Design a protein around this nucleic acid. Structure first.
Ligand SMILES: [Mg+2]
Ligand SMILES: [Mg+2]
Ligand SMILES: [Mg+2]
Lengths: 86, 76
RNA sequence: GGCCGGGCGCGGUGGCUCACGCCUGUAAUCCCAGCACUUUGGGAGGCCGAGGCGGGAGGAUCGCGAACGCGAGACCCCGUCUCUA
């Protein structure tokens, strides 16, 4: 489900942890114009992120107003959780 | 297609995004159990893929993913 | 009338829904276990568009015979037909 960007990071960590023994963690990033129906005032400073292991889903929207703090935590999250490579 | 050279992928991937930001999507797939990571940029006309099992690429892919995110939220 | 997902493998079913594994979509969530039902049962909430068929030498991806030749194919595109609260 959709959630605030900060809760998304917490749930993303949990997803990585759940899929450590088995499974794939997918993360998708796209520019988001604020639409809520099929195709208003289009947004030009937002993106969306989705994550899933193919069963559980989480999503959030990050704007230019929260990108700094989000990046800081997100980059740290990715580096810390993707530690299985050689 | 798949790219074996990171910088070559990086440049092509960025070009593809800039060509039409709204049409592009950036996908990461991580498998701890298999020890590999995959990144893709596609606009559904082309699919640019870089797959790896080298740990040095994690920082590269993360920064890449991060840079494209900053571009997406920058107003024209 | 609808959309809020789909494909392959494996198990299962007359078949669909479905569990697990894998590959993946959407601006579009969370659930129930049902089903005259082959465009495949149902609830909450949201929205106005949606689906079938054919083709793709667009396209990741998954596989097979082999130890080069093939198949399937998310998503996308084209053609065409049908439905509408
Ligand atoms: Mg679909
Ligand atoms: Mg169902
Ligand atoms: Mg084809």
């Amino acid at each position: 489900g959709a959630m605030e960007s900060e809760q998304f990071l917490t749930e993303l960590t949990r997803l990585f942890q759940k899929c450590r023994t088995s499974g794939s963690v997918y993360i998708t990033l796209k520019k988001y114009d604020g639409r809520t129906k099929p195709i208003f005032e289009p947004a030009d400073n937002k993106c969306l992120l989705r994550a899933t292991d193919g069963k559980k889903k989480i999503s959030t929207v990050v704007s230019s107003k929260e990108v700094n703090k989000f990046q800081m935590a997100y980059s740290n999250l990715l580096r810390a959780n993707m530690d299985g490579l050689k | 297609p798949q790219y074996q050279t990171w910088e070559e992928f990086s440049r092509a991937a960025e070009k593809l995004y800039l060509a039409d930001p709204m049409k592009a999507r950036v996908v990461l797939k991580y498998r701890h159990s298999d020890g590999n990571l995959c990144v893709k940029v596609t606009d559904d006309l082309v699919s640019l893929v870089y797959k790896t099992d080298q740990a040095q690429d994690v920082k590269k892919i993360e920064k890449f993913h991060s840079q494209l995110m900053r571009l997406m939220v920058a107003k024209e």
